[PDB]
Design a protein around this ligand. Structure first.
Ligand code: CDL
Ligand code: PC1
Ligand code: 3PE
Ligand code: LMT
Ligand code: LMT
Ligand code: LMT
Ligand code: LMT
Ligand code: LMT
Ligand code: LMT
Lengths: 61, 558, 73, 188, 100, 80, 494
């Protein structure tokens, strides 16, 4: 009975128009680009350190 | 400062014959070594491959002063073993600042703390360690053949005297005799090596020999075959003194025979100084042009010793039942790893060598400290095992068998887990520090083409992990044959402690049982700090590894 | 650990289960055990591996219709 | 290449290894706890030295013999010599499983050392810029298509543009049938 | 046609499905090229999914004579079946094909 | 992580491990002052590692600049 | 801080509370066991929060934290669809693993709870780390707690069982370390974003493959190298058995999606026939010798070897279906193997003190609730439809057939042989005659504890079998990134 009730409530509607909870859920987990901006910075640094590790470890004796 | 401390301690020790004064001579030795740390700490304000001092017979390098500090700290940690009584009495009523600093406790401390134990009655014991330390910090700073020979003997002769200092022990006198006799034959090889250098070069200075080797390295009546031959004999003497296979048979016997307090120092300090001196010699004796001089490199003996040390150290250790023989063989397989990074002379290998050496000296110290503390904890325990009544020198080495650690998990869980954390570091299990050390020495060898040796190291690391796990199986997989002494808790057996304020007025009187006796804080805190360093290294690694990256950058620089 | 219920442990089955557990301690290298070991560990895997190599990428069925051939190679 | 006198080299291998074992037999005589005398090196410890010459001689002779047959010099020959050397070690103990087992261990290690490169001596130096070599490897992100198709080959889901026309040519050559799939639409 | 959904603006690729002229050390441009190629391969396979749904309704509508009424849909599905697989970007990223 | 926090907790963890080895009661009130003391010593060792790190960063940065001038001066002299 | 670091601290916080509660009261062991169980539930609530927020079609790692401070070794946490379900499986099992073994420990209970709370952190980390040396660090940090879990709370042959797991896993994993060190030397870092851009030369790839596969073959495990599992799983306590099969055997499965599929593609392609030849052999031999095993708990362990081989051939298919089926069969194995271990190690051994199938017969007559669940978990082991185990096997087997048809044809024989041993074990314990005569006294049926963990594990297996899209929608886009190949008209677009 609960599953039938819960599923009926959580449906979007006739044509789009999501419910208030749907609006809330999509809003909190937006992260429009903040995973990309943080991954790109970290990839850039760890790429620099690889160049540095190669420069210090392969130096003329 | 080490020389001002030796002569001052010597003069005070010369005019006394009181054996109760030993406790305070070891305490002043700790304070004296702290001033040496503060002086060498100020001697790090320059970037230099090296500066020749006192007529060119000595040198200072950032690596020399860094490792003078390390030697003094390792000595300070070992000196505590004779600066503080093994056990203490602690009550919640005497635990505050007002109590520890302004109040006082009165009780019969003699049998509880072992006031008159053998270790607490050698007046010249703090003095002779200082003599060994002096020869160690001279080896690191030697720029001449003569200074090398005089420094190595200063260190060797004091190690022999340490091994023989328990004169009433028929095990210690034998071990020192074995050590002096096999150590003297080693000294002949070091002296033959330097003699053959001077007769073919006319020089005693390392830098002149370095420049003679430098000019010879170009891809007629005087071909320099002598340098790689002389250094080869010169390497045999130092290979013996670090107990690298095949010149290793003495260490299991000597480390097992002398007292455990002594083997902590004997089995650590000598390898610290010998391995540093070899590194600079390996660097400036390198070949930059593959010629016939490079085909006879003396560094091959270190590559064969490393291969032999990896195999012998892990294979022979499988059937050891005596704990100090086991730890002796475990050190042999660890110098096979140290010797492999020395033989590959690369920026990465030199950084791996500096880390392996420091982290292992610190970790093998924890293993000795835990062993000494476990023996001092069985004071409130009784055993009926027949194999323990037949043991010898039970005061010099209270723990001699791995059978004696059966069920220690039940007796002391965190002391057992500390020894577990240390032992798993010797195996190389992540996230423990000993893993990162072997990681750096496997990556250095692999990147330089020592793939065959790297495969042999990881195979013996499995073999050597077998006898490490056997010690763990004993401590945690079985119940203890050691049981609490029945008399120490009889409900009628209590010792009266008195609490006194500043002017000797009885604040309180307490009734105490054997349950109010614990380990002294100097040994519990020291064990706690090193176990944490082995465990939390992956959160505190930047400045330790950065120091080594900088030290190697100066050595290889230009 | 926890007390279990009472089982009529058959001495014959208990010693049989003990036998199965310690059996490896008595394996020897005979002409027979080598023959079975060589067949199972070498011959069968080498035969399966050989066919795996010979027929690898040999056939594809997707979208193949009449007038096309299943054989890729 | 230059052929090697296998028999001449074989004696050198037997003498060098058998000389060392003769030195090992001598330690046994020196350490003997009874008055065995000087001639105990060739009577009681003679087998120890003899098997050293046998093992060393077979290794170098079979290594040289292997090189002549294959007309090449590489790590493979260190495998044939090691297998025959280990086989000789197993012959002394008289146990079949070990004749094969000792040959296995010896052959694998003596070939693994050579294929890796001689670690026990000075490793070969390329004499190049290490920074350039390492950096090229890290930044060689894309490669010519021809380079990869050489190691893996087209097929197994690697259908490079033009795979179908080539497959038609390949299938026509081998099967002698022209590929012409059916329409599936009755109209057009 | 059908309006482009709001959810179909956030995930719409802003770059062409290619690796040519893409600096790899610019991680931002590189990951979007990876995303652009994967999204195209997926649109192609869902294009065949939708044609297959229409084929089924033509099959259950025409019954016996589907063999002469559903041929256009059969063509399109068989075209897509031979051409759309999700093969990834890894080969595409690691090789360049000159097209000459 | 923050060095001051890691070292402050390192000193806290050393006090906890000490009493566990001695099998003494963690949290006796008349001896609670040891936790601020051990942690305070931990905080101090950390301001020092912060000074060590600051100087190591400067000198490792310089070295990477030196290896780049050497590789460049050598490259320039090879253009002839 | 990030939300992926909260996953790690909570089990550490629980370790601290178990260690300090005696210092505030002589405290009961029931209080230690509620702390450990509440701590594992909170980790499961966080992990469900992470899954609600997770983006199912994103190519960037999510829930990361801007380090901005670089050291020699630094922890970098992130989540992708390839790893989210492995995290969820770890967080659903660990609570049941504790509840299953709630009464059976009796001695050293704090130590037991601390090891499991420590294992949960180490196994959670191995899925969350974004470097390959950090992967190795946690993929091998689990070996000291597991050596002591088996030695302290294991069965009779525990000492040898614990030596086998540690030494084989140590030996096998040290060939992985050599391969990882080589890649770091050539690229300068093991951070995934930088390593996945890099393309190795074929010869380097073919030697990096030899060393990652040697590690994985020991840890899968394959047939001639599976001796450690036949000892480890059986002599382990019930709780350790649940972790080792459900979570530790999956570390090698998830390690191919990181260490092999994206960075050694040409080597994986040209060597698949070696993998498939081994995988085929370990499907047959393991299954033939699972038919003749007389220890029930070792019959469940042998079954795991046959299933791991199906998912290993699935990860080497270069197909989208066999790759997702491999992850589904690893998730499915996590629930079903947990239930069968609970039945053998936690219900029969609890009541009889024996594991020999000689002594069990007709158990359905006196224990009808046990036989119902036991039947359902035996059917899932047999890959019956309506269970998640069928979906994973079908997709794993199809990609195997599409890659190299012949080996998938032998591997398909698992449908006849998994069925053979599963029903044969069932008919000999639940059925097979009347209640045995070796049972002197009657045995009670399932407890409300035994019932509800078996019911929970069966519920996950069946519901996910009906609607596998709960897991399939998350993996699609991320699986799409590990495929190697082109199509002649879909590639190189202008
Ligand atoms: C990488 C490195 C990272 C490092 C980060 C920080 C690590 C954690 C911090 C460690 C702090 C240890 C020192 C504090 C301490 O012991 O407090 C407990 C201790 C009392 O707590 P307790 O353990 O319950 O005492 C039991 C009884 O006192 C009966 O105790 P006992 O008679 O057995 O011995 C008492 C005392 C004997 O020694 C002393 O009296 C200490 C003297 C220190 C100054 C000289 O023992 C110790 O203090 C041992 C400390 C070992 C330090 C070296 C370890 C290596 O404090 C004191 O009374 C000691 C004096 C007060 C501190 C003054 C000096 C502060 C700075 C010291 C720098 C060295
Ligand atoms: C697990 C390992 C356990 C090891 C136990 C010891 C823990 C510490 C490990 C070694 C860390 C490095 C120690 C180097 C010496 C201490 C230097 C230091 O911390 O501060 C420098 C300072 C030096 O200060 P300074 O007085 O010379 O000059 C200060 C200069 N300014 C103003 C810029 C700060 O401490 C000292 O005085 C050095 C003497 C130390 C006494 C003995 C210490 C032994 C430890
Ligand atoms: C006594 C215990 C019995 C245990 C077994 C029970 C089996 C049947 C369980 C009941 C099935 C319906 C209830 C399911 C609860 C979840 C609700 C839901 O997801 O949708 C169910 C759906 C009702 O949705 P509805 O309201 O009709 O939406 C359109 C309205 N304009 O309704 C449906 O979709 C009906 C179709 C259900 C499946 C029918 C069988 C197909 C597979 C065989
Ligand atoms: C885990 C244990 C705790 C961390 C262990 C390491 C901490 C100490 C590392 C010190 C070494 C590196 O840190 C740095 O190195 C250089 C090396 O010459 C030295 O630096 C010294 O010479 C330079 C150059 O003239 C001066 O600028 C500097 O002021 C002076 O101190 C010091 O030693 C230290 O400033
Ligand atoms: C579902 C799992 C199994 C799927 C994979 C197995 C598919 C097996 C396909 C076998 C047929 C492959 O394709 C088949 O190859 C055979 C040769 O072997 C060839 O067979 C051909 O033989 C003769 C020549 O001898 C030709 O003149 C004739 O036209 C044709 O029959 C054709 O090329 C094709 O009929
Ligand atoms: C079981 C033990 C098997 C042997 C141990 C593994 C050996 C791996 O060692 C392998 O040797 C070959 C020989 O050049 C090298 O392989 C590669 O080296 C360089 C790449 O840097 C290339 O120029 C060369 O063409 C290529 O063969 C590598 O050094 C390594 O991939
Ligand atoms: C890297 C090393 C390997 C790490 C592997 C993980 C090991 C984890 C071990 C857990 C910590 C030790 O666990 C510790 O066990 C001892 C058993 O003597 C307990 O100690 C107590 O146990 C019971 C409790 O009623 C008492 O009867 C006993 O007298 C007392 O010693 C501690 O309260 C517990 O904390
Ligand atoms: C690929 C090849 C293999 C890879 C590496 C795997 C190596 C595994 C080797 C483990 C060998 C077994 O290890 C050894 O087992 C014996 C049991 O017989 C244990 O012995 C123990 O168990 C016996 C059983 O009767 C008891 O008496 C007692 O608890 C103890 O002696 C040893 O403590 C352990 O060291
Ligand atoms: C069945 C298992 C068989 C293999 C088991 C052991 C192998 C484990 C991984 C070994 C990785 C291969 O070995 C690795 O290959 C790369 C190139 O390919 C080498 O890179 C290269 O370094 C030096 C320095 O430039 C080169 O001169 C040389 O050509 C090559 O050795 C690495 O130095 C080596 O570490």
């Amino acid at each position: 009975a609960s599953s039938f009730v819960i599923y009926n409530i959580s449906r979007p509607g006739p044509n789009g128009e999501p419910s208030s909870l749907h609006k809330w859920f999509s809003k909190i987990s937006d992260y429009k680009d903040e995973w990309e901006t943080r991954n790109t910075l970290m990839a850039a640094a760890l790429e620099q350190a690889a160049h540095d590790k190669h420069l210090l470890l392969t130096a003329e004796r | 400062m080490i020389m001002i401390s030796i002569l001052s301690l010597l003069l005070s020790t010369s005019v006394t014959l009181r054996r109760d004064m030993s406790i305070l001579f070891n305490r002043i030795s700790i304070i004296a070594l702290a001033y040496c740390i503060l002086h060498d700490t100020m001697s790090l304000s320059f970037i230099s491959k090296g500066i020749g001092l006192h007529g060119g017979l000595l040198h200072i390098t950032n690596l020399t002063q860094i490792f003078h500090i390390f030697i003094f700290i390792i000595s300070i940690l070992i000196l505590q073993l004779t600066s503080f009584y093994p056990r203490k009495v602690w009550i919640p009523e005497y635990s505050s600042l007002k109590d520890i600093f302004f109040n006082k406790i009165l009780y019969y401390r003699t049998k509880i703390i072992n006031k008159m134990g053998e270790h607490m009655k050698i007046i010249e014991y703090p003095l002779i360690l200082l003599f060994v330390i002096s020869g160690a910090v001279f080896l690191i700073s030697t720029n001449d053949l003569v200074s090398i020979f005089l420094s190595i003997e200063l260190q060797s002769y004091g190690l022999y005297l340490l091994s023989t200092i328990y004169r009433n022990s028929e095990l210690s006198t034998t071990g020192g005799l074995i050590y002096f006799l096999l150590g003297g034959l080693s000294s002949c090889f070091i002296l033959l090596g330097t003699s053959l250098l001077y007769v073919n070069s006319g020089t005693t200075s390392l830098d002149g020999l370095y420049i003679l080797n430098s000019i010879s390295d170009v891809n007629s009546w005087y071909k320099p075959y002598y340098l790689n031959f002389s250094l080869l004999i010169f390497s045999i003497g130092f290979l013996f003194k670090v107990s690298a296979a095949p010149f290793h048979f003495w260490s299991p016997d000597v480390y097992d025979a002398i007292p455990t307090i002594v083997t902590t120092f004997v089995a650590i300090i000598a390898k610290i100084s010998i391995f540093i001196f070899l590194l600079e010699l390996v660097y400036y004796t390198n070949s930059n042009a593959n010629s016939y001089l490079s085909e006879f490199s003396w560094t091959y003996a270190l590559l064969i010793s490393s291969l032999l040390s990896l195999i012998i150290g892990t294979v022979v250790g499988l059937t050891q039942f005596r704990i100090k023989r086991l730890l002796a063989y475990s050190t042999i397989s660890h110098v096979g790893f140290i010797l492999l990074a020395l033989s590959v002379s690369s920026i990465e290998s030199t950084q791996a060598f500096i880390f392996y050496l420091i982290q292992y000296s610190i970790s093998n110290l924890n293993a000795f400290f835990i062993l000494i503390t476990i023996g001092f904890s069985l004071y409130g325990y009784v055993t009926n095992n027949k194999e323990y009544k037949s043991l010898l020198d039970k005061n010099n080495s209270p723990i001699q068998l791995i059978s004696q650690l059966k069920g220690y998990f039940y007796i002391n869980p965190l002391l057992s887990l500390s020894l577990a954390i240390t032992i798993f570091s010797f195996v190389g299990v992540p996230p423990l520090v000993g893993f990162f050390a072997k990681q750096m020495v496997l990556s250095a060898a692999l990147d330089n083409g020592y793939i065959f040796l790297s495969l042999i190291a990881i195979i013996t690391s499995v073999i050597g992990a077998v006898y490490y796990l056997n010690v763990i199986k004993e401590i945690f997989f079985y119940s203890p044959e050691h049981e609490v002494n029945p008399v120490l808790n009889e409900s009628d057996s209590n010792f009266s402690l008195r609490i006194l304020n500043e002017k000797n007025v009885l604040i309180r009187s307490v009734l105490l049982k054997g349950r109010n006796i614990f380990i002294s804080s100097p040994f519990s805190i020291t064990i706690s700090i090193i176990t944490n360093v082995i465990l939390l290294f992956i959160f505190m690694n930047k400045e330790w590894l950065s120091m080594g990256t900088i030290l190697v950058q100066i050595l290889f620089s230009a | 650990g926890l007390q279990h219920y009472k089982i009529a442990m058959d001495p014959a089955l208990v010693r049989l289960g003990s036998m199965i557990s310690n059996r490896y301690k008595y394996f020897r290298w005979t002409k027979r055990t080598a023959l079975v070991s060589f067949m199972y560990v070498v011959v069968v895997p080498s035969t399966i591996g050989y066919l795996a190599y010979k027929t690898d990428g040999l056939w594809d069925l997707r979208a193949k219709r009449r007038g096309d051939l299943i054989s890729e190679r | 290449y230059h052929p090697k006198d296998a028999v001449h080299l074989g004696l050198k291998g037997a003498a060098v290894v058998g000389g060392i074992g003769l030195l090992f037999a001598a330690v046994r005589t020196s350490l003997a706890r009874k008055n065995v005398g000087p001639w105990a090196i060739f009577t009681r410890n003679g087998k120890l030295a003899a098997t050293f010459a046998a093992v060393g001689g077979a290794y170098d002779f079979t290594r040289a013999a292997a090189a002549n047959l294959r007309e090449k010099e590489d790590w493979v020959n260190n495998g044939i010599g090691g297998l025959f050397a280990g086989a000789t070690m197993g012959l002394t103990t008289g146990r079949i499983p070990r004749v094969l087992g000792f040959a296995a261990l010896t052959g694998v290690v003596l070939a693994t050392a050579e294929y890796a490169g001689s670690g026990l001596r000075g490793v070969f130096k390329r004499d190049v810029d290490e920074y350039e070599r390492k950096e090229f490897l890290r930044k060689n992100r894309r490669r010519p298509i021809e380079e990869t198709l050489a190691e893996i080959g087209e097929g197994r889901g690697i259908k490079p543009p033009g795979y179908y026309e080539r497959r038609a040519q390949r299938l026509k050559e081998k099967y002698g049938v022209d590929i012409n799939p059916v329409c599936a639409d009755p109209d057009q | 046609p059908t309006p482009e959904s709001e959810a179909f603006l956030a995930k719409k690729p802003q770059v062409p499905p290619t690796f040519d002229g893409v600096d790899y050390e610019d991680n931002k441009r590189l990951k979007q090229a990876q995303d652009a190629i994967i999204r195209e391969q997926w649109v192609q396979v869902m294009m065949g999914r939708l044609v297959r749904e229409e084929l089924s309704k033509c099959y259950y509508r025409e019954g016996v004579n589907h063999l002469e009424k559903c041929g256009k849909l059969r063509e399109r599905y068989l075209q897509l079946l031979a051409n759309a697989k999700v093969k990834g970007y890894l080969f595409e990223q690691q090789n360049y094909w000159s097209k000459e | 992580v923050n060095r001051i926090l890691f070292w402050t907790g390192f000193g806290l963890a050393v006090r906890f491990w000490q009493l566990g080895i001695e099998m003494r009661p963690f949290f006796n009130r008349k001896s609670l002052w040891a936790y601020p003391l051990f942690g305070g010593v931990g905080a101090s060792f950390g301001y020092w590692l912060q000074s060590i790190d600051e100087k190591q960063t400067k000198m490792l940065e310089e070295r990477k600049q030196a290896i780049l001038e050497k590789r460049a001066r050598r490259a320039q002299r090879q253009a002839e | 801080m990030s939300l992926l670091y909260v996953l790690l601290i909570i089990p550490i916080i629980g370790i601290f509370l178990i260690s300090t509660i005696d210092s505030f009261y002589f405290f009961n062991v029931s209080y230690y066991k509620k702390i450990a169980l509440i701590t594992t539930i909170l980790n499961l609530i966080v992990s469900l929060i992470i899954y609600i927020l997770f983006d199912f079609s994103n190519n960037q790692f999510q829930f990361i934290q801007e380090n901005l401070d670089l050291s020699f070794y630094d922890i970098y946490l992130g989540v992708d669809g390839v790893s989210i379900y492995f995290v969820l499986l770890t967080t659903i099992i660990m609570p049941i693993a504790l509840v299953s073994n709630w009464n059976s420990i009796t001695n050293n209970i704090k130590s037991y709870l601390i090891i499991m709370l420590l294992l949960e952190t180490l196994l959670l980390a191995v899925f969350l780390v974004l470097d390959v040396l950090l992967f190795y660090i946690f993929f091998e940090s689990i070996l000291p707690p597991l050596f002591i879990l088996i030695g302290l709370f294991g069965s009779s042959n525990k000492v040898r069982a614990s030596f086998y797991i540690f030494l084989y896993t140590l030996l096998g994993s040290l060939f992985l370390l050599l391969s990882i060190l080589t890649m770091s030397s050539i690229v300068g870092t093991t951070y995934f974003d930088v390593l996945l851009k890099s393309s190795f030369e074929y010869t380097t790839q073919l030697f990096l493959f030899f060393g990652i596969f040697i590690a994985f073959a020991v840890k899968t495990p394959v047939w001639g190298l599976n001796s450690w599992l036949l000892r480890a799983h059986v002599e382990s306590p019930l709780g350790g058995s649940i972790v080792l099969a459900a979570i530790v055997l999956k570390l090698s499965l998830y390690g191919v999606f990181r260490l092999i599929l994206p960075i050694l593609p040409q080597a994986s392609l040209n060597l698949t026939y070696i993998v498939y030849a081994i995988g085929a052999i370990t499907v047959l031999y393991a299954s033939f010798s699972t038919l003749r095993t007389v220890d029930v708990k070792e019959l469940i362990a042998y079954s795991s070897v046959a299933h791991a081989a199906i998912y290993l051939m699935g990860v080497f298919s270069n197909t989208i279906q066999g790759l997702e089926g491999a992850i589904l069969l690893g998730l499915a194995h996590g629930f079903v193997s947990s239930g069968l271990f609970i039945c053998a190690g936690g219900i029969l051994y609890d009541r009889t003190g024996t594991r020999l199938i000689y002594f069990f017969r007709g158990l359905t007559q006196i224990m009808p609730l046990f036989s119902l669940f036991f039947f359902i978990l035996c059917l899932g082991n047999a890959g019956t439809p309506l269970t998640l185990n069928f979906v994973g096997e079908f997709m794993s087997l199809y990609g195997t057939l599409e890659r190299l048809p012949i080996a998938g044809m032998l591997a398909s024989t698992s449908i006849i042989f998994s069925a053979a041993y599963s029903i044969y074990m069932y008919n000999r314990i639940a059925f097979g005659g009347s209640v045995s005569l070796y049972f002197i006294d009657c045995f009670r049926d399932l407890t409300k504890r035994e019932f509800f963990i078996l019911f929970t594990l069966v519920s996950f297996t069946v519901i996910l079998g009906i609607y596998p899209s709960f897991v399939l929608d998350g993996l699609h886009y991320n699986i799409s990134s590990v495929v190697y190949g082109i199509e002649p008209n879909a590639s190189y677009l202008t």
